[PDB]
Amino acid sequence: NTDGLAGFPRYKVANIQQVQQQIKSSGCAVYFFAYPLTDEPCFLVDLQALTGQQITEIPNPYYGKYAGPLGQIQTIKGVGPNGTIFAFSDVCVHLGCQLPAQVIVSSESDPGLYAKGADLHCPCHGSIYALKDGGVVVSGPAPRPLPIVILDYDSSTGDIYAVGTNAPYFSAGIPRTTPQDNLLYDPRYSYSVPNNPSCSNG
Numbered sequence: 001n002t003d004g005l006a007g008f009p010r011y012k013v014a015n016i017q018q019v020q021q022q023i024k025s026s027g028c029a030v031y032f033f034a035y036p037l038t039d040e041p042c043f044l045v046d047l048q049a050l051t052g053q054q055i056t057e058i059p060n061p062y063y064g065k066y067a068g069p070l071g072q073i074q075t076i077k078g079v080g081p082n083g084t085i086f087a088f089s090d091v092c093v094h095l096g097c098q099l100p101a102q103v104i105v106s107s108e109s110d111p112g113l114y115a116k117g118a119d120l121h122c123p124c125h126g127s128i129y130a131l132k133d134g135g136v137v138v139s140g141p142a143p144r145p146l147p148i149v150i151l152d153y154d155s156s157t158g159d160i161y162a163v164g165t166n167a168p169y170f171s172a173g174i175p176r177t178t179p180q181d182n183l184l185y186d187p188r189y190s191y192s193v194p195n196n197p198s199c200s201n202g
């Protein structure tokens, strides 16, 4: 379908109660999915469950870098009844390693997701993405922010939908130069999607 934003599909990720039940039962604030294509891993994250902070809006660092309307988004609002659910690509934009967002860590210098800071550290070359600052790079070699998956919460049903991205994912074999290039099939994208709940302490 093209019922998402600017030519993207509208894809149901999960119901809010699936996310909340997982957080209550396991403590795991990360929820993996694939979008817009089956081989493109992403994750939802409840930034308040993760950090203890009421994070309800983060910047779009790619404003004006791509055509509108996706390029015209200034900020990304958190979704659901608490306003705190966001989503990102799970593919590092340095060299395409899959990011271990499920490995919850207590130091900034450990690969994984540093919960207190909402910082996602790639094991391959040490890129660190500041999720609560819109995925911007705060350390390491990644040349641009981690792409955000734009979400829409259906208040009638509780369902959380993925509806676009603010940027192209990592370019592996096929160049991706616009968000909508995420709709291109690249056989080099062979990444799996972790089972939920996936979190571990690392």
Ligand code: FES
Binding pocket: 092, 093, 094, 095, 096, 097, 122, 123, 124, 125, 126, 127, 140, 141, 142
């Ligand atoms: S592939 Fe992630 S830091 Fe290089």
Ligand SMILES: [Mg+2]
Binding pocket: 117, 118, 119, 130
């Ligand atoms: Mg930090």
